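>> Question from a student workshop board

For tomorrow's exercise we were told to take the sequence and the ligand below, predict the bound structure, and bring the output to class. My setup keeps failing. Could a helper post the expected result so I can at least see what it should look like? The ligand is 1,2-dipalmitoyl-phosphatidyl-glycerole.
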Amino acid sequence: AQGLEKARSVLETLQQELTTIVPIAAAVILLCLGIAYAGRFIEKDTFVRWSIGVIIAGSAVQITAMLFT
Amino acid sequence: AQGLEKARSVLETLQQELTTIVPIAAAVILLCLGIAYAGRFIEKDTFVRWSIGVIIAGSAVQITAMLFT
Amino acid sequence: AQGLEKARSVLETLQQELTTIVPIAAAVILLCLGIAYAGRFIEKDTFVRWSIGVIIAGSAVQITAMLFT
Amino acid sequence: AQGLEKARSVLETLQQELTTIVPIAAAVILLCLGIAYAGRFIEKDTFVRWSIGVIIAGSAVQITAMLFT
Amino acid sequence: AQGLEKARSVLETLQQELTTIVPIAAAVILLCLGIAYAGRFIEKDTFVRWSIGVIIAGSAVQITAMLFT
Amino acid sequence: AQGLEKARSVLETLQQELTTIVPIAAAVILLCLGIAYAGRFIEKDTFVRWSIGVIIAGSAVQITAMLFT
Amino acid sequence: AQGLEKARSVLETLQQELTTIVPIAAAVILLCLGIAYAGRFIEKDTFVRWSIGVIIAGSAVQITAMLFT
Amino acid sequence: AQGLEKARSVLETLQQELTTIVPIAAAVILLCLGIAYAGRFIEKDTFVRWSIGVIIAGSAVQITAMLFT
Amino acid sequence: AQGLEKARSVLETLQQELTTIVPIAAAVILLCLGIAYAGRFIEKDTFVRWSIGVIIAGSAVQITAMLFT
Amino acid sequence: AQGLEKARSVLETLQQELTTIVPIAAAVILLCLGIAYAGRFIEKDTFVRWSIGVIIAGSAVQITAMLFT
Amino acid sequence: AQGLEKARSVLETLQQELTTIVPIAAAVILLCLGIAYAGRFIEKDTFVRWSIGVIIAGSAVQITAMLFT
Amino acid sequence: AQGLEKARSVLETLQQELTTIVPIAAAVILLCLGIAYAGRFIEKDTFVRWSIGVIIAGSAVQITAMLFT
Amino acid sequence: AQGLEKARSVLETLQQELTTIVPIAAAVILLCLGIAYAGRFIEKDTFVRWSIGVIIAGSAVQITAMLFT
Amino acid sequence: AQGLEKARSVLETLQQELTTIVPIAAAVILLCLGIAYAGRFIEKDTFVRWSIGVIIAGSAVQITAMLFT
Amino acid sequence: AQGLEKARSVLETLQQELTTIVPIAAAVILLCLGIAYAGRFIEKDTFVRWSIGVIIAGSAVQITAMLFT
Amino acid sequence: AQGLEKARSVLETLQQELTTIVPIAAAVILLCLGIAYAGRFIEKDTFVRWSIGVIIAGSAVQITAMLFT
Amino acid sequence: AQGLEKARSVLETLQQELTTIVPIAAAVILLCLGIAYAGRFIEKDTFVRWSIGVIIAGSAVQITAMLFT
Amino acid sequence: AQGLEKARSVLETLQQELTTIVPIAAAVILLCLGIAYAGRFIEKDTFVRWSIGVIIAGSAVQITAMLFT
Amino acid sequence: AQGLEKARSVLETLQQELTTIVPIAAAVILLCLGIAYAGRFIEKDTFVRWSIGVIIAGSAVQITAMLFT
Ligand SMILES: CCCCCCCCCCCCCCCC(=O)OC[C@H](COP(=O)(O)OC[C@@H](O)CO)OC(=O)CCCCCCCCCCCCCCC
Ligand SMILES: CCCCCCCCCCCCCCCC(=O)OC[C@H](COP(=O)(O)OC[C@@H](O)CO)OC(=O)CCCCCCCCCCCCCCC
Ligand SMILES: CCCCCCCCCCCCCCCC(=O)OC[C@H](COP(=O)(O)OC[C@@H](O)CO)OC(=O)CCCCCCCCCCCCCCC
Ligand SMILES: CCCCCCCCCCCCCCCC(=O)OC[C@H](COP(=O)(O)OC[C@@H](O)CO)OC(=O)CCCCCCCCCCCCCCC
Ligand SMILES: CCCCCCCCCCCCCCCC(=O)OC[C@H](COP(=O)(O)OC[C@@H](O)CO)OC(=O)CCCCCCCCCCCCCCC
Ligand SMILES: CCCCCCCCCCCCCCCC(=O)OC[C@H](COP(=O)(O)OC[C@@H](O)CO)OC(=O)CCCCCCCCCCCCCCC
Ligand SMILES: CCCCCCCCCCCCCCCC(=O)OC[C@H](COP(=O)(O)OC[C@@H](O)CO)OC(=O)CCCCCCCCCCCCCCC
Ligand SMILES: CCCCCCCCCCCCCCCC(=O)OC[C@H](COP(=O)(O)OC[C@@H](O)CO)OC(=O)CCCCCCCCCCCCCCC
Ligand SMILES: CCCCCCCCCCCCCCCC(=O)OC[C@H](COP(=O)(O)OC[C@@H](O)CO)OC(=O)CCCCCCCCCCCCCCC
Ligand SMILES: CCCCCCCCCCCCCCCC(=O)OC[C@H](COP(=O)(O)OC[C@@H](O)CO)OC(=O)CCCCCCCCCCCCCCC
Ligand SMILES: CCCCCCCCCCCCCCCC(=O)OC[C@H](COP(=O)(O)OC[C@@H](O)CO)OC(=O)CCCCCCCCCCCCCCC
Ligand SMILES: CCCCCCCCCCCCCCCC(=O)OC[C@H](COP(=O)(O)OC[C@@H](O)CO)OC(=O)CCCCCCCCCCCCCCC
Ligand SMILES: CCCCCCCCCCCCCCCC(=O)OC[C@H](COP(=O)(O)OC[C@@H](O)CO)OC(=O)CCCCCCCCCCCCCCC
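>> Workshop helper replied:
Here is what the output should look like for this input. Compare the format with yours to find the bug.
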């Protein structure tokens, strides 16, 4: 019931599937970035940027719950 | 009665349902943005923009009541 | 009497009902706009536009009385 | 007498009643336009158009007397 | 009896058949959109648009029951 | 029977044929994009875009089943 | 038969012809890039970019088969 | 006999004649499009559009037999 | 006879005449493009675009025969 | 006769006249570029660009005959 | 006659007038450059750049005749 | 005799007179277009359009004889 | 006589009058463009555009006679 | 008489008035540009641009007479 | 009279008022620049730039009268 | 006499009266257009359009005498 | 008398009244533009546009008398 | 009386009310700009832009009276 | 009354609430900037920029009252 309960369930399923997919994408990104940095194509702060992005992505639900009260 | 009370109640129900749905959408957006920033596709101000948008969306009713007096 | 007093009363009732409905619509619009801005779909001037629109709509009667003298 | 004095009086009464009705319609129009502009459905020049229309309608008798001499 | 019970049954049958047909059309649309995005003919927000449209279409009956009360 | 089962079968046949055709189009697009990138006409994000598009197109039926429930 | 078998054959012929043409285009691009680099008009990463692009274009069918399953 | 067999034969003859005529028109269109693109009057997607149109027109009978079952 | 054989012959004559005219137009286009590029009004990719367009227009009949089977 | 022989002759006359005009335009362009480069407004690659453009424009007919076979 | 003889004459007049004007502009540029170099605002290669530019601009017609044959 | 020989002669006379008139109109149009282009009111492709139109209008009889056989 | 000789004479008079008027319009346009360029409102290619337009407008009759043969 | 002599006289009057007005506009532009350059808001080539624009606008009549012959 | 004498007078008034205002702006700019230079935020050439800009702005009318003759 | 002398005199009187009225309407139109342009509601070419229209209307009799001979 | 003197007087009265009204509208427009520019919503050329529009509207009668002679 | 006196009074009231409202909007804009500049989101010229806009807005009536004479 | 008094009160409330919110945002910005500067990600002038921005934002009302008189 409630009209949009079904859409909420679908969105929850989509969020779970995207969360499952994300670590593979992050690992592939890091694999490419490490070799790019080894080849003098990018700089060392790229690893810090990647770490910040991955840490933020990991706790996306917690941050959203903290902000969207 | 009052003619348009039923429409107002329907709009209230719609607002409640959209408010219930919104946190999932915000979490999915943040999850995507984290990986996008990790992969050097966007910039660091994206997180600030997301935080501002989510904070405004969380207090939409209060802001509307403050402005539409 | 006066021929069109009844129509004026009906219009006043309609105006009151629409004024009652409007804050919910404004809150829903702001809720959608916040998430749209979080996801990089719109820009920050949208909030300024929304604020101006809501402020104008809130004092519609006063502005009408000021201009239509 | 004068044949059309009665019709002129009826027209004057109708004009007065319509003038009484108009401000409510203008207020309702502005209330709708403000929310429409808040939701990105119209542009900012709509308010200028509304102001010009209301100002012209307010002084309809004076403009008619100035032109129809 | 009830005059329009037969017409309502026909409409329900048509709705069920259209609901059955829709997923194939959605899959074809997504298949075309993926290749169009791969070929640099459209943008990444097309997937978000498609997801929103499909989610709305899937819960059409629930949304109609929530609004048309 | 069921009125629209024939149209559903036709749509399924069309979907299967389009799925058969798609890999050739994707291969041609990738072949052109590789030479375009070698010639300094596009950037490296084109390959990521192509990969995302092809992956989404490949699992169109699964995504449609996940969302259109 | 099967509706789109003829179109699939035409697309396969087009793909084979484009694959035949591509090596000449890649060779001309490399010939121009080498002289441009000799004249201090481009940088040394251009050769890496060209190699990556040509390698990806060469195995376009294999990559498409790996991703579009 | 069958009443409309003669009309069907006339339609088949017209279809064969138009099918014979079309390749010349396609060649002329491509000849004009190549020069127009060389002179910076159109874009490179025009060739993709032309190829899709020609492939669809060539296998029109097969597609019609696949859809009109 | 064949009904439309005369129209086909007329189209062939028109195609031959346009093919005869085209090289002059291509030469004029390239003559203008060279001077425009000399004066810093356009970029160096214009020559690649022109070459692609002229090569495609030259073999328009062959491409049409390859695609329109 | 031949239908478009007159148009071809007109195009050849136009091409010859433009070829006659071009050297003056190239000389004026080089005269302006030299002074602009003397005043530190442009860089030394401008002369290479101008030389390439003028050389290409000089043999436009030969290049067109080479590519449009 | 010849169609573009008049335009060619106008272009020649413009070229002669610009050639007459140029030495004054070159002298002013050199006068400014000398003082700028005296005050440590530019480097000594500026004079070499100016000399190359002025020498190239002086023989613009001869270089154009050498290249545009 | 021949019934319509007189009408054909009248049409030929009208065609000759219109052909005599046209060059003046074309010259006036080009005179206006040049000034409009100088004043930044139109674009450079207007000259190409004008040239194509004038060339087609010049050999209208030849094209009509080539097509209407 | 000749039916349309009078219209041709009128058109010639109109063309002569427009040719007389044009130099004033060109001078005014250049006067405005120079100040606009001095005020950073347009770019330096505006002068090239103006010169091309004025030169074309000057020899409009000659170009018309060359193309419309 | 001469049909358009009156319009030509009006255009000459407008040109004279605009020529009278222009020096004030140029002076105001230079006054603003000097302070803008002092405040590090623009660059030093702005004065060269202004000088070129003013010199061109000053001799607009002479340039128009030289080109429009 | 003379049509645009009023506009010229208004422009002269605006020029005089801006000339009156400018010294205050120049003084404020120099006051900020001195402290910015003392704090190691800018370099010593800023004062030369400021002096050149102020000197040019002070004699804007004289330079305009010298160039716009 | 002459049947239509009276009608011609009436038309001449009407033309004189309309010519007397026109300047006021043109001034009002320009006054409105100036404010509309100041308010960013229209573009700068509106002034050119107005000037062309007013100049044409001013010499309407002369143009009519030139064309209608 | 003169038939249309009354309409001319009415138009003169309307012109005077609109001229009286205009300065208030111009002041309001400038007040809004200043705040919009301070809020980074528009650019600095808006003030130049406003000044030009107001100056043109101020001398509308003079410009009309200069052009409509 | 005078027809448009009432509209002028209404416009004066609107101008006074907007002038009263403006300082709050300017203060809010400055408050947001200061924090945005502190967070490295905008540059230091924004304060100069804001000051220019506010100074222009404050003396809107005086500038309108100076230009619209 | 006075029409826009209500809007002014709403704007004052919004300004007070934004002023209340601002110190937290400034503190968070400084907290992030300190760590960024510690990790060699930004320079030491960032603190000066932050101090200037915060000081300007703190006295926004006073500065607005000083400039907007
Ligand atoms: C003086 C030396 C200074 C620089 C040091 C290096 C100089 C010479 C280096 C020789 C390298 C030659 C080739 C290796 C390239 C290299 O060293 O760059 C490392 C490569 C990506 O690096 P980059 O992003 O820097 O590529 C070049 C760009 O920088 C050009 O802007 O990472 C890999 O995974 C290697 C892939 C090999 C290429 C084949 C790929 C085919 C399969 C993948 C396609 C699937 C589609 C989806 C993918 C997400
Ligand atoms: C040879 C050494 C040269 C460099 C020295 C340092 C190298 C190694 C540094 C190790 C750092 C590892 C991780 C610490 C990061 C660090 O040191 O960088 C400081 C960080 C911002 O740093 P950056 O802007 O430099 O990030 C990278 C950019 O430079 C990319 O260009 O400031 C913080 O607030 C730290 C937050 C921790 C990350 C987790 C955040 C999750 C919750 C917050 C999300 C809420 C959303 C809204 C927020 C407003
Ligand atoms: C690389 C990253 C760059 C971009 C960042 C985001 C990338 C990935 C984002 C994933 C989002 C997936 C889904 C969330 C969508 C999202 O993120 O966009 C926010 C959404 C609408 O915003 P948009 O303007 O972006 O909508 C799509 C447009 O982009 C179309 O062009 O607001 C919502 O309330 C979410 C609702 C979810 C959809 C279900 C709704 C069904 C019930 C409502 C119908 C009732 C009828 C009356 C309504 C008034
Ligand atoms: C020198 C290195 C410089 C660049 C660093 C990275 C280089 C190599 C990266 C390899 C990545 C390969 C693939 C991962 C892509 C990646 O790393 O980019 C992160 C991706 C979004 O990336 P972008 O917005 O940059 O996409 C490409 C655009 O930039 C094109 O302009 O976020 C994800 O969620 C990844 C999903 C994987 C793809 C499968 C999705 C299928 C199911 C979802 C569909 C449901 C519909 C609704 C959705 C809301
Ligand atoms: C420098 C690179 C910049 C661009 C990157 C790509 C360059 C080269 C691309 C090569 C593509 C060659 C051909 C593949 C085309 C391609 O890659 O574009 C993808 C195609 C449509 O894409 P577009 O939106 O670009 O179509 C043309 C538009 O651009 C027109 O403006 O989607 C498909 O399903 C492909 C079908 C192949 C054509 C045969 C279809 C016939 C049977 C179907 C008919 C049934 C009727 C009902 C249908 C629902
Ligand atoms: C100084 C160096 C800086 C830049 C590096 C390169 C400079 C010199 C490059 C020389 C290249 C010369 C020619 C090769 C072109 C090249 O290198 O660009 C790669 C080409 C597409 O390139 P672009 O999209 O950049 O084309 C020009 C556009 O950029 C215009 O803006 O991809 C191909 O498949 C090549 C095909 C050859 C052309 C013949 C095709 C005819 C048959 C196909 C038609 C069928 C219709 C349907 C199609 C789907
Ligand atoms: C501190 C030193 C650092 C920089 C060194 C130079 C600084 C001072 C230079 C003083 C120069 C002052 C004036 C000379 C200008 C100069 O030195 O720049 C050289 C000039 C064009 O140069 P630019 O393209 O650099 O012009 C400025 C541009 O850079 C603005 O973006 O070439 C000429 O032909 C000179 C014409 C003089 C202007 C009169 C022309 C009037 C008749 C022609 C119009 C016909 C229309 C159609 C034309 C195709
Ligand atoms: C202090 C030194 C610093 C710089 C070092 C070099 C300075 C002096 C160099 C002298 C070079 C003079 C001439 C050689 C040119 C040179 O060095 O540049 C190399 C040239 C392209 O170079 P760029 O891209 O740098 O061209 C100029 C651009 O940089 C403008 O931004 O590559 C070639 O293939 C050469 C062709 C010769 C030109 C004739 C071509 C005509 C027929 C081909 C056209 C067919 C159309 C289709 C094509 C795909
Ligand atoms: C710091 C320097 C930066 C810029 C470098 C150059 C600055 C100075 C250049 C001086 C050039 C002055 C005049 C030469 C113009 C020039 O150099 O630009 C090259 C010209 C066209 O160039 P554009 O497309 O750039 O024209 C202006 C456009 O850019 C406007 O957007 O090509 C020609 O054929 C020249 C013809 C001369 C004009 C007479 C033509 C009359 C007969 C033809 C009409 C027949 C109708 C049918 C036509 C198909
Ligand atoms: C971010 C900023 C971007 C936009 C800048 C401006 C924003 C704020 C502007 C405030 C304007 C408030 C009101 C002034 C309006 C304004 O500024 O627009 C200028 C006005 C007409 O302008 P528009 O064509 O833009 O009218 C509105 C159009 O947008 C309709 O779509 O011209 C006037 O004459 C003003 C008259 C005032 C209204 C009273 C007239 C009553 C008597 C006349 C009736 C006689 C009948 C016959 C007439 C021929
Ligand atoms: C910080 C510096 C950066 C930018 C540099 C400039 C900043 C300051 C400039 C001060 C300008 C103030 C006023 C001078 C204006 C100025 O400098 O712009 C130059 C003006 C036209 O310039 P624009 O096309 O740029 O006009 C503004 C447009 O850019 C708006 O988008 O040329 C003139 O002829 C001057 C006329 C003065 C206005 C009065 C005209 C009234 C009678 C004529 C009407 C007859 C109708 C028919 C006409 C054909
Ligand atoms: C390594 C460091 C490099 C960057 C330095 C800063 C990094 C970390 C900064 C942390 C900031 C976190 C959040 C504070 C945001 C911040 O610091 O940015 C300052 C904020 C807007 O600034 P921006 O233009 O940067 O906004 C985001 C844009 O950058 C997106 O492109 O100004 C404010 O007024 C703050 C309001 C707080 C947000 C809550 C508002 C909710 C109620 C008000 C809504 C009423 C509607 C009508 C309004 C007119
Ligand atoms: C190891 C040392 C190396 C660096 C030396 C200095 C280090 C420490 C310096 C401490 C300075 C702390 C504060 C003084 C600032 C300072 O020293 O910088 C000097 C300041 C401008 O400096 P900057 O342009 O460098 O500002 C920061 C920028 O560099 C950010 O990129 O000039 C002033 O007028 C100072 C005003 C004080 C701030 C209050 C202003 C509020 C009212 C005015 C607003 C009205 C709006 C319109 C205005 C036109």
